[PDB]
Amino acid sequence: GMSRKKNPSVIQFEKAITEKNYEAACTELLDILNKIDTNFGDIEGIDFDYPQQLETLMQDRIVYFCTRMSNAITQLFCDPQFSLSESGANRFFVVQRWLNLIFASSPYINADHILQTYNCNPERDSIYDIYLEPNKNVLMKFAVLYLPESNVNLNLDTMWETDKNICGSLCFALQSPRFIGTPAAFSKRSTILQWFPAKLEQFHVLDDLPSNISHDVYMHCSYDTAENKHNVKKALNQVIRSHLLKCGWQDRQITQIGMRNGKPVMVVVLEHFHSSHSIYRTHSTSMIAAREQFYLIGLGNNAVDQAGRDVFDEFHEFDGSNILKKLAFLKEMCEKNDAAVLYMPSIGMDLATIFVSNARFAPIQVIALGHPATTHSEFIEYVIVEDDYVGSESCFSETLLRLPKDALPYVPSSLAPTDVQYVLRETPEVVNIGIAATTMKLNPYFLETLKTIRDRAKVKVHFHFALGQSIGITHPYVARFIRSYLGDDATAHPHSPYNRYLDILHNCDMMLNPFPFGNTNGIIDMVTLGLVGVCKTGPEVHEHIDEGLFKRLGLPEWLIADSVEDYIERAIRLAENHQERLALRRHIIENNGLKTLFSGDPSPMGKTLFAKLTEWRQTNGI
Ligand SMILES: O=c1ccn([C@@H]2O[C@H](COP(=O)(O)OP(=O)(O)O[C@H]3O[C@H](CO)[C@H](O)[C@H](O)[C@H]3O)[C@@H](O)[C@H]2O)c(=O)[nH]1
């Protein structure tokens, strides 16, 4: 068939390896991994032959692909004549999360069998220790293949002293997957969140780090369980600020407050704002309402649709991928309008936005919690959040503007089902428990908790995981992880179209929410299907939303657990107590608390920010 561009090819990769054309082999491997990255794990459009038995068996074909690719990478990286360049190593660190899955979704688990070929010390105390010859080539190959699922010992202080850039690059790579759930991967990331911030702080630029996964580092620390998990963000901001200044940046001087139609100007900088996205559903009504106090200028990408653009008085596209040009365009927009407020409803999904948060454009700079975590930025004054979603204020470096619980009325998805079907089983022989969670939300604590519920419950249970982001070569690994805790008592469903996803959940008798990072959309889905479930609460907003939303929707407090032991007890109770469970489901079906999420007075955000501006003006005399 005709296509836009030649597909990356396993055959061409293998051929280059055979010919010891190392440059062409590296190029083909990077092209394969980059295309997988583009398609979020899907391997369509990567060329390979396979036995005809696998034509209709997608999971088996994916494992075959991962196995074949693992074999080829083994042949290449074990070759002592293969010399990896520094720019080569940098490109591999950016896609290490995909390398991980090539091994982790194969039967091999990891690339440790390659690492073992690099050991030069026959007198080692442990097979888990790898001693390298003192050349940068073997150190880089070691580090590139030190994967999340590796069982090899690595002492970070040792690596740091040997080569800071390689050490830092590996630490980025190990933070960057969207599934860091296994004991081995979660343990590495855990250790990094404690050890790495004081080291990362020492970098002055991002030039020798894998820059393209910086925003993943920024976002992903929120899925760890440590109280101080967001510390790496403070460190990353310092590096970003330094990097920005070393590119010649100068902060805007605030000398005037511009007016348009007699109102001060709010510039809104958007990461995702298509009307099909959550952030539009959660945050658009309060922006529209703020036009009563401010003139709103929205800056977003080409992909924003008309409904998205229309929330603003005027809208401008960000032309291209260059971050300096974006900040320059934003700077000129704030200068031209003498902007009063800079608002970012989400920060973290784009590196450009993180740069923005580390510079001065307007006297009041504000985020909302599209990604629910503190910035640790010195340049962000305020966070907009619903009062009932806040746990501890100490989780944020910013000052929280705690709005009324109805101040951000949601807009319903247009894909919302209109003729929901209900299965209310009176006395099921097996209680089917649905878990709607992106892979980022899975971790050993959560899985161990489910295992305990299974082992202690006096009813039989089966866990159905509806796994957002478990796509293509991600899936076997995630499935094996689940199996390692729950055996035959769980089913791992790949990321699916919305209707399939709702079919999976609707056949469950109850749901359980992940922790520490809970759900929002998944709770909406739950009550849409007339289901009930248990959640865990805690101090972060991303821990506490579930509690607030359950209360908004009229679910009772016993379903909201403080400790892990509490969660276990409440989950068992909901599973065992068939009549109690069905009564709550009848409450939810009849009450339709969902409709109340779409109502509220949206004016507080505008009014609160206007009051803050007033106070700023009379403090500063501008
Ligand atoms: O197999 C699947 C899994 C999920 N979904 C859909 O995806 C929704 C869940 O959204 P995501 O997959 O993006 O997961 P989250 O709800 O955790 O994500 C949302 O909340 C985040 C903050 O935690 C960010 O704001 C993110 O961009 C936003 O989508 C579900 O309600 C459903 O509509 C499917 O259709 N099929």
Three-class SS of 249-269: CCCCCCCCCCEECCEEEEEEE
Q: What is the DSSP string of 389-408?
A: G-S-GGG-SSEEEEE-TTSS
- Among 335, 446, 317, 399, which Cα is nearest to 608's? 399
Token representation of residue 312: 């603003």
Q: Exposed/middle/buried for 307, CB within 10 Å: 0-12, 13-18, 19+?
A: middle
Q: What is the DSSP string of 228-255?
A: TTTHHHHHHHHHHHHHHHTTT--PPP--
Helices (H), 457-520: 475-486, 498-506
Q: What is the DSSP string of 288-357?
A: HHHTTTSEEEEEE-TT--HHHHTTSSEEEE--SS-HHHHHHHHHHHHHHHT-SEEEES--SSSHHHHHHH
Q: What is the DSSP letter of 14?
A: H
Q: Exposed/middle/buried for 341, CB within 10 Å: 0-12, 13-18, 19+?
A: buried
For residue 467, give the ligand 1 atom closest to its CA: 1
Residue from 283, 498, 517, 597 to probe ligand 1 pocket by mutation (most atoms less than 8 Å from CB) = 498
3-state helix, strand, coil in the chain (%, to 5): 50, 10, 40
At position 369, the amino acid (one-letter code) is: L
Residue 138: CB atoms within 10 A of its CB come to 18
- Among 471, 548, 488, which Cα is nearest to 513's? 548
Q: What is the DSSP letter of 384?
A: E
Residue from 274, 501, 528, 540 to probe ligand 1 pocket by mutation (most atoms less than 8 Å from CB) = 501
Using CA atoms, how far apart are residues 11 and 34, in angstroms rounded to an integer? 17
- Among 245, 258, 425, which Cα is nearest to 341's? 258
- Among 385, 325, 315, which Cα is nearest to 352's? 325
The residue ranges of every structural domain in the chain are 1-216, 264-407+599-622, 408-598
Token match 């442990």: residue?
A: 126
**What is the 325 CA–ligand 1 centroid distance (Å)?**
31
Using CA atoms, how far apart are residues 556 and 550, in angstroms rounded to an integer? 7
**E strands present in 471-611:** 490-493, 510-512, 533-536, 560-561
Closest Cα to atom 35 of ligand 1: 498
Beta carbons of 435 and 418 less than 8 angstroms apart:
no
Using CA atoms, how far apart are residues 359 and 595, in angstroms rounded to an integer? 40
Beta carbons of 535 and 550 less than 8 angstroms apart:
yes
Tally of CA atoms within 13 A in the half-sphere of 450 that contains its CB: 29
Instruction: Report CA torsion sign: 170, 171, 176, 179.
Output: positive
Using CA atoms, how far apart are residues 333 and 267, in angstroms rounded to an integer? 8
Token representation of residue 231: 């510390």
Using CA atoms, how far apart are residues 492 and 278, in angstroms rounded to an integer? 24
Using CA atoms, how far apart are residues 149 and 135, in angstroms rounded to an integer? 25
Residue 374 three-state SS = coil
Using CA atoms, how far apart are residues 116 and 340, in angstroms rounded to an integer? 59
- Among 198, 185, 31, 17, which Cα is nearest to 97's? 185
**What is the 277 CA–ligand 1 centroid distance (Å)?**
9
Token representation of residue 438: 């992106």
Using CA atoms, how far apart are residues 540 and 223, in angstroms rounded to an integer? 11
Q: What is the DSSP letter of 410?
A: P
Q: Exposed/middle/buried for 163, CB within 10 Å: 0-12, 13-18, 19+?
A: middle
Using CA atoms, how far apart are residues 85 and 153, in angstroms rounded to an integer? 24
Beta carbons of 346 and 271 less than 8 angstroms apart:
yes
Closest Cα to atom 25 of ligand 1: 370
For residue 370, give the ligand 1 atom closest to its CA: 25
Q: What's the length of the chain?
A: 622
Between strands 510-512 and 490-493, the pairing is: unpaired
Residue 492 three-state SS = strand
Beta carbons of 571 and 535 less than 8 angstroms apart:
no
Residue from 521, 527, 531, 594 to probe ligand 1 pocket by mutation (most atoms less than 8 Å from CB) = 521
Residue 18 three-state SS = helix
Token representation of residue 504: 């999976």
Token match 């609160």: residue?
A: 608
Token representation of residue 539: 């101090």
Token representation of residue 311: 């929330």
Left if phi > 0, otherwise alpha if psi is -120 to 50, otherwise beta: which for 492? beta
Instruction: Report CA torsion sign: 580, 558, 590, 509.
Output: negative
> Radius of gyration over alpha carbons of the chain, in Å?
26
- Among 420, 467, 479, 607, which Cα is nearest to 182's? 479
408 to 288, 381, 556: CA distances (angstroms) = 11, 20, 23
Residue 142 three-state SS = helix
Beta carbons of 124 and 136 less than 8 angstroms apart:
no
Q: Which residues line ligand 1 (CB under 6 A)?
A: 278-279, 370-372, 438, 466, 468, 495-496, 498, 501, 520-522, 525
> Residue 462 is inside which H or E element, if any?
strand 460-468
Residue 461 three-state SS = strand
Token match 């005037």: residue?
A: 256
**Long-range contacts for 576-584 (Cβ within 8 Å, ≥24 apart)?**
576/457, 576/458, 576/459, 578/426, 578/427, 578/428, 581/509, 581/510, 581/532, 582/424, 582/426, 584/532, 584/555, 584/556, 584/559
Q: What is the DSSP letter of 470?
A: -
Beta carbons of 525 and 548 less than 8 angstroms apart:
no
- Can the peptide bond before residue 516 be classed as cis, meaning omega within 30 degrees of 0? yes
85, β-bridge pairs = none
Beta carbons of 90 and 210 less than 8 angstroms apart:
yes
**Long-range contacts for 401-404 (Cβ within 8 Å, ≥24 apart)?**
401/366, 401/605, 401/608, 401/609, 401/612, 403/286, 403/604, 403/605, 403/608, 404/600, 404/601, 404/604
Using CA atoms, how far apart are residues 135 and 128, in angstroms rounded to an integer? 21
**What is the 438 CA–ligand 1 centroid distance (Å)?**
7
For residue 277, give the ligand 1 atom closest to its CA: 29
Token match 């101040």: residue?
A: 407
- Among 362, 361, 359, which Cα is nearest to 264's? 362
Closest Cα to atom 4 of ligand 1: 468
b (16+ CB within 10 A) / e for 63-102 = bbbbbbbbebbbbbbeeeebebeeebbbbbbbbbbbbbbb
For residue 522, give the ligand 1 atom closest to its CA: 31
**What is the 346 CA–ligand 1 centroid distance (Å)?**
15
**What is the 412 CA–ligand 1 centroid distance (Å)?**
14
At position 153, the amino acid (one-letter code) is: N
- Among 66, 69, 99, 242, which Cα is nearest to 176's? 99
